[PDB]
Paper text:
Human T-cell Leukaemia Virus type 1 (HTLV-1) is an untreatable retrovirus that causes lethal malignancies and degenerative inflammatory conditions. Here, we show that high-resolution crystal structures of the mature-length HTLV-1c CA protein define essential lattice interfaces and identify a distinct ligand-binding pocket. Across the known Orthoretrovirinae, CA is a two-domain protein with HIV being the best characterised. However, our structures reveal that HTLV-1 does still have a pocket formed between helices 3, 4, and 5, albeit an electropositive one capable of binding to either phosphate or sulfate in vitro.
During screening, a third crystal form of HTLV-1 CANTD was observed diffracting to 1.47 Å resolution in space group P212121 with two molecules in the asymmetric unit. In this case, the crystallant included 0.2 M ammonium sulfate. In one of the HTLV-1 CANTD molecules, a sulfate ion is unambiguously resolved bound to an electropositive pocket on the NTD surface formed by α-helices 3, 4, 5 and 7. The sulfate ion is coordinated by residues H71, H72, R98, and W117. The sidechains of Q56, H72 and R98 appear to act as gatekeepers that flip up and down to allow the sulfate entry into the pocket. Mutants that would remove a direct interaction with the sulfate or phosphate groups (H71A, H72A, R98A and W117A) all effectively abolished infectivity with a concomitant loss of particle production. As the equivalent site has been exploited for the development of arguably the most potent and longest-acting anti-HIV drug, our structural and phenotype data suggest that similar attention should be paid to this site in HTLV-1 with a view to the development of capsid-targeting pre-exposure prophylactics.
Author numbering: 1 to 127
């Protein structure tokens, strides 16, 4: 998660088990990508403002190995398409995209990465 308190520099902190547990229990048996699943995960992304790495960890914790593999493939395609368009806050001469999306200071890029990560669930059967 990225902590961005008012008027102080942002910083990354690791996921805490109690936070992950609450997300998993709220999702319960809702199919990945379903309206109930997305309603919960959208709120989790807002509350914890996760980096790209944090989102990989959340996907791995919440979903089966199969769903995670499908999501990985879909998001990789969406990222390639987004790079062709240009992405808010992404400088192609700086770090790898996913490194930049782990930089707490690059909030605009992280938020756009979050949107792509959420959108990748739409490719799954279920919804």
């Amino acid at each position: 998660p990225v902590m961005h308190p008012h008027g102080v520099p942002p910083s990354h902190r690791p996921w805490q088990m109690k936070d992950l547990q609450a997300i998993k229990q709220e999702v319960s048996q809702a199919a990945p990508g379903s309206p109930q699943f997305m309603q919960t995960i959208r709120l989790a992304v807002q509350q914890f403002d996760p980096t790209a790495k944090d989102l990989q960890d959340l996907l791995q914790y919440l979903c089966s190995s199969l769903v995670a593999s499908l999501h990985h493939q879909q998001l990789d395609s969406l990222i390639s398409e987004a790079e062709t368009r240009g992405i808010t806050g992404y400088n192609p001469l700086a770090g790898p995209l996913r490194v930049q999306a782990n930089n707490p200071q690059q909030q605009g890029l992280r938020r756009e990465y979050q949107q792509l990560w959420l959108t990748a669930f739409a490719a799954l059967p279920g919804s």
